[PDB]
Ligand binder design. Structure first.
Ligand SMILES: *S(=O)(=O)c1ccc(C(=O)NCCCn2c(=O)n(CCC)c(=O)c3[nH]c(C4CCCCC4)nc32)cc1
Ligand SMILES: *S(=O)(=O)c1ccc(C(=O)NCCCn2c(=O)n(CCC)c(=O)c3[nH]c(C4CCCCC4)nc32)cc1
Ligand SMILES: CCCCCCCC/C=C/CCCCCCCC(=O)O
Ligand SMILES: CCCCCCCC/C=C\CCCCCCCC(=O)O
Ligand SMILES: CCCCCCCC/C=C\CCCCCCCC(=O)O
Ligand SMILES: CCCCCCCC/C=C\CCCCCCCC(=O)O
Ligand SMILES: CCCCCCCC/C=C\CCCCCCCC(=O)O
Ligand SMILES: CCCCCCCC/C=C\CCCCCCCC(=O)O
Ligand SMILES: CCCCCCCC/C=C\CCCCCCCC(=O)O
Lengths: 383, 384
């Protein structure tokens, strides 16, 4: 009794935290034009899936818990929404990971590559494939034949009426081989790899800017204290090459022009005059080049900042979801093994609970959601 | 071992669905892309289209599956019967919204934009669907023949839930269909809409009549003429040109009137010639633009009315059939009359897109653009 009330209460509480948060996430993206980006469009899809868990999956579980025995088909139908919705989440996250990859990987062609319509197609695909994976049990892959044998062996007519249990209607072979090994693990590992790559790229790109910045300062010391024009030329050419790398506009025009005006001397062989260019290059550097460096730093570090937040979401997803899979694997491979009910129950509470986390982590980590949620709260949900 | 009649039913259903789904998807497409259709009326036409897409994509397939399929549990047949009830109810309320929107424009044109706002239109839409789900899901809450079938199942002497040939009249209560759905949730909306449109026409025809009255008053027409011209003027980027056309006119009417106090006709003819120049210079624009904008209000109203007429004409037979089955269970009614009634209702989901294309100019131009830009296969036309 009190345990059932506790289950129902915890479920109700998880649902009560889940639904408003994700509705608020979906709200936040619609109102705010600063969140009109591919990443956020997938966060809306991911939020929608979480709203569906709290609004549909958790109520069904409670209704099945408090309810009577059901037909096989009834229990089979009720088992699928969570399979669809959980699958949608994974693909939605994978979309976010590849979107995060593409930005840093192909920044010049990003806007022409990743377009709203393509993002929409990608979204639609996730849901289509999610319905495909989640409805597979409805097509036939289940224990119907296994239960019909026991129903006839017991000697009962018509469709099997049973206590609605997941393991009674959904095939563990399906859950382990099809769902987990094909449709969970490879996306997870691929995403885990993609993020490592995303960090690797950003850290290297940050390193390259500091490399170019230090190269440009280091060679000014070489030019200012050089004996032979050959030393100055070797500095100037590397400074130029560094400037052409750093450019990948008009500050760089003015700089590279002054490097050419310096270089022009080095062909004749006059060091004295080359010091006059060096003083101007320092003026150009401080006039123009600091801006590019600082803005590149800030915009790269902003790419880094989000990546961590989006990674944390993946970590939380994986950490929330892996237990219930491990449980499905150990039940399949070791049916002889006993596994305590509390471990089963906390695993299930973690999965439903995962629908509450995203809105909370967005509020804590992502600045633009924080400012919006406050505005929505103040303007609409304030006492 | 399938009957040619069954094949014909399935084929006609499939064809109706094949005409219905693309048309309404194209209607929903047309409103989204075109900013000229970003108006309250069209926002209800999207909701009405969505309902029709659902008939062709969900209701017609379910009917075919039930037709070709086996006997079902009572609950299965009860569940499958409801979507059409929801969707049909949505249509009526969506049309009623359109009727009152058409009324409000002509009734309160000055305050229309401040009254009928996007959010209010959205709330109104949402309401239609909520109430539609309420009316349509009522049978799922309990109002059905379950107890009536359970008696016969036990009387036959069979255990468990009733398995039966899935028929509408076997699971849905006729009392519900006649008293609740038809008498409360169909007829009053229909009659109210029928009244609203008559009023909408009445207003527009009178407003058109008044402009021609003022125009004819001005052209027929010293004091008795001038006072009527004045009275007509008081009744009567661009607003500046109208304002100033009226300044130039009323100024010349004052310059004419100035003579009438003294009493000199000869000179007043000099003003009359200038007033005709002012009329043809400025006043024709106001008249013609008012004519065009009023006649555009008239043009849509007829199209939207035709949709109501077609809806009522498509839907009333199946209701009459439900009433006569309820009140006269002894009465025999031929199957063809039952079948054409049912074909009409599913068919109604195909009509709206077709009538929009024929009558409404802005949908016609859009459907062509969507066809050309997305669904064109010109190399087949070149291939011929
Ligand atoms: S209690 O023991 O009475 C009890 C009451 C209610 C519930 C419950 O809410 N169950 C819903 C979760 C069912 N379920 C799944 O939905 N999935 C799919 C996830 C996408 C599973 O993979 C799953 N595995 C299991 C168990 C776990 C270990 C024991 C055998 C399978 N349940 C799953 C539960 C208990
Ligand atoms: S044939 O006789 O085998 C046959 C095959 C298939 C169908 C069929 O597709 N029927 C679907 C229509 C069911 N139906 C409704 O949906 N509604 C609700 C409208 C919003 C009705 O009101 C309704 N009334 C009836 C009949 C009418 C005459 C006999 C009594 C009930 N069916 C309705 C049909 C036949
Ligand atoms: C018993 C199952 C019933 C199935 C009904 C299927 C239809 C589902 C309803 C969806 C709501 C559609 C809302 C459309 C609003 C359009 C708003 C707009 O014009 O922008
Ligand atoms: C939210 C409001 C209540 C949540 C707790 C409800 C628990 C009911 C327990 C009764 C039972 O055992 O079925
Ligand atoms: C067996 C029945 C399964 C029912 C599953 C429930 C799913 C309901 C929730 C969402 C489905 C529609 C997907 C819409 C995605 C829109 C995301 C976006 O706005 O980008
Ligand atoms: C056998 C497999 C069954 C497949 C059923 C199809 C399910 C499709 C569900 C939802 C499609 C719409 C998703 C929303 C796409 C729009 C994305 C956007 O523009 O934001
Ligand atoms: C669109 C097609 C509509 C109707 C097709 C009807 C085909 C009838 C062939 C029946 C053959 C038979 O079963 O004997
Ligand atoms: C027009 C009407 C011709 C189609 C008549 C359909 C009868 C179907 C009979 C059946 O399905 O058994
Ligand atoms: C009978 C009790 C159950 C009631 C359930 C009602 C389900 C409501 C479903 C959809 C309503 C939301 C429609 C959104 C309309 C959007 C309008 C707009 O913004 O254009």
């Amino acid at each position: 009794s009190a345990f059932q009330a506790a289950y129902i209460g915890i479920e109700v509480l998880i649902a009560l935290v889940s639904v408003p948060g994700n509705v608020l996430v979906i709200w936040a993206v619609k109102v705010n034009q600063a969140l009109r980006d591919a990443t956020f469009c997938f966060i809306v899809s991911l939020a929608v899936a979480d709203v569906a868990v709290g609004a549909l999956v958790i109520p069904l579980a409670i209704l099945i818990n408090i309810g009577p025995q059901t037909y096989f088909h009834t229990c089979l139908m009720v088992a699928c929404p969570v399979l669809i919705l959980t699958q949608s989440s994974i693909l939605a996250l994978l979309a976010i990971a590849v979107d995060r990859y593409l930005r840093v990987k192909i920044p010049l062609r990003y806007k022409m590559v990743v377009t709203p319509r393509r993002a929409a197609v990608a979204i639609a695909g996730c849901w289509i494939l999610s319905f495909v994976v989640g409805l597979t049990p409805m097509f036939g892959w289940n224990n119907l034949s296994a239960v019909e044998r026991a129903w006839a062996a017991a000697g009962s007519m018509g469709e099997p009426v049973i206590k609605c249990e997941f393991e009674k209607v959904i095939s563990m072979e399906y859950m382990v081989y099809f769902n987990f090994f094909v449709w969970v693990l490879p996306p997870l590992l691929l995403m885990v790899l993609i993020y490592l790559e995303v960090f690797y790229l950003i850290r290297k790109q940050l390193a390259d800017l500091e490399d170019n910045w230090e190269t440009l300062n280091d060679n000014l010391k070489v030019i200012e204290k050089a004996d032979n024009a050959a030393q100055v030329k070797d500095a100037l050419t590397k400074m130029r090459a560094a400037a052409l790398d750093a450019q990948k506009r008009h500050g760089f025009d003015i700089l590279v022009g002054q490097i050419d005006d310096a270089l022009k001397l080095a062909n004749e062989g006059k060091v004295k005059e080359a010091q006059a260019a060096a003083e101007q290059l320092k003026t150009t550097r401080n006039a123009y080049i600091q801006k590019y460096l600082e803005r590149a730093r800030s915009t790269l570090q902003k790419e880094l900042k989000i990546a961590k937040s989006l990674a944390l979401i993946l970590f939380l997803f994986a950490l929330s979801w892996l237990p219930l899979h491990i449980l499905n694997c150990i039940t399949l491979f070791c049916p002889s093994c006993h596994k305590p009910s509390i471990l089963t129950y906390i695993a299930i509470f973690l999965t439903h609970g995962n629908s509450a986390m995203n809105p909370i982590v967005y509020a804590f980590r992502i600045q633009k959601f924080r400012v919006t949620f406050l505005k929505i709260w103040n303007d609409h949900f304030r006492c």
